[PDB]
Write an enzyme that holds these catalytic residues in place. Structure first.
Site, PDB file in Angstrom:
ATOM      1  N   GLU A 108       0.905  -1.268   0.065  1.00 13.82           N
ATOM      2  CA  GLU A 108      -0.130  -0.033   0.050  1.00 13.82           C
ATOM      3  C   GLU A 108       0.991   1.210   0.047  1.00 13.82           C
ATOM      4  O   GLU A 108       1.948   1.449   0.853  1.00 13.82           O
ATOM      5  CB  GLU A 108      -0.969  -0.178   1.285  1.00 13.82           C
ATOM      6  CG  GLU A 108      -1.707   1.112   1.498  1.00 13.82           C
ATOM      7  CD  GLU A 108      -2.287   1.129   2.752  1.00 13.82           C
ATOM      8  OE1 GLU A 108      -3.162   0.228   3.086  1.00 13.82           O
ATOM      9  OE2 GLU A 108      -2.561   2.186   3.354  1.00 13.82           O
ATOM     10  N   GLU A 128      -1.733  11.494   3.543  1.00 12.95           N
ATOM     11  CA  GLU A 128      -2.690  11.513   4.511  1.00 12.95           C
ATOM     12  C   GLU A 128      -2.914  12.881   5.296  1.00 12.95           C
ATOM     13  O   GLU A 128      -1.693  13.313   5.626  1.00 12.95           O
ATOM     14  CB  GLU A 128      -2.857  10.368   5.660  1.00 12.95           C
ATOM     15  CG  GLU A 128      -3.103   9.078   4.769  1.00 12.95           C
ATOM     16  CD  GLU A 128      -2.744   7.864   5.675  1.00 12.95           C
ATOM     17  OE1 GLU A 128      -1.812   7.340   5.680  1.00 12.95           O
ATOM     18  OE2 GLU A 128      -3.751   7.520   6.504  1.00 12.95           O
TER      19      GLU A 128
END
Ligand SMILES: [Ca+2]
Length: 265
Positions: A143, A148
């Site tokens: 991933e 973020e």
């Protein structure tokens, strides 16, 4: 804020990043066609609406719903709302709606320079992200969290990767963080430079995160020799709600000016 890295960073980077001279644009969305997102480029992820999303998240991701996902005034808009969409067939009991788009099954890349120019979603509770997962379990397949942010600490940008060896289930993820100016009020470019040798994750042409291939041929520490697809979302709660959810913050938008993918070709 920090992704379980309270007293340092686990994948420090500090070098310039830019589109390599031998690369070409192989995929883009400029979001200049108002209405729904282009269905040749984007799908809605509804996979866990009925079951509940992960991470103590609070949102239902609505598909085909302009109130949550719309192309408007030269941007993709993903908008969070406080509402229960109880007549959706896949309703899961949630008190909020948002959007999650991905290119899974439409477009994926092995290696390349990915640039996403965006203005983020603010308000305590919000958790905007720009990230990738492998086309072919988790977290072994790899991933890549390009961006973020958690809006209790809205100037901190986080860049993180997960692998079998290095992942948030066992708190061994490899990541870094930096500060960006008013990310909900001005655009920044969030970037990944992924090669066989390393990934760089950055903001505005500065890599603040670097993860090297250790060259051991161990898929557990480097799964990233296989294609990945792109993901855009605004989660609510979980890490975004570590200091509560601000009812007054809704509705809250992330505006994505473009997605551009470059590769050697
Ligand atoms: Ca645009």
């Amino acid at each position: 804020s920090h992704m379980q890295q309270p007293e340092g960073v686990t994948a420090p980077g500090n070098e310039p990043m830019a589109i390599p001279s031998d690369y070409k644009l192989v995929w883009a969305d400029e979001f200049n066609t108002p209405g729904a997102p282009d269905a040749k480029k984007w799908r809605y992820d509804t996979s866990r609406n009925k079951e509940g999303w992960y991470n103590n998240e609070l949102q239902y991701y609505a598909a085909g719903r302009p109130e949550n996902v719309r192309v408007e005034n030269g941007n993709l808009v993903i908008e969070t709302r406080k509402e229960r969409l109880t007549s959706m067939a896949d309703y899961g009991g949630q008190e909020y709606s948002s959007g999650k788009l991905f290119t899974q099954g439409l477009a994926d890349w092995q290696y390349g320079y990915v640039e996403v120019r965006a203005k983020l979603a603010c308000g305590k509770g919000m958790w905007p992200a720009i990230w990738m997962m492998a086309s072919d379990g988790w977290p072994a397949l790899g991933e890549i969290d390009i961006m973020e942010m958690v809006a209790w600490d809205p100037t901190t940008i986080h860049g993180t990767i997960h692998t079998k060896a290095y992942n948030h289930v066992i708190h061994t993820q490899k990541g870094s963080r930096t500060t960006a100016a008013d990310p909900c009020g001005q655009f920044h470019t969030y970037s990944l430079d992924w090669t066989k040798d390393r990934m760089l994750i950055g903001v505005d042409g500065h890599a603040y995160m670097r993860f090297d291939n250790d060259h051991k041929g161990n898929h557990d520490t480097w799964p990233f020799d296989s294609p990945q697809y792109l993901i855009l979302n605004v989660a609510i709660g979980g890490w975004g709600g570590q200091q509560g959810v601000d009812a007054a913050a809704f509705p809250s938008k992330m505006e994505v000016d473009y997605v551009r993918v470059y590769q050697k070709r």
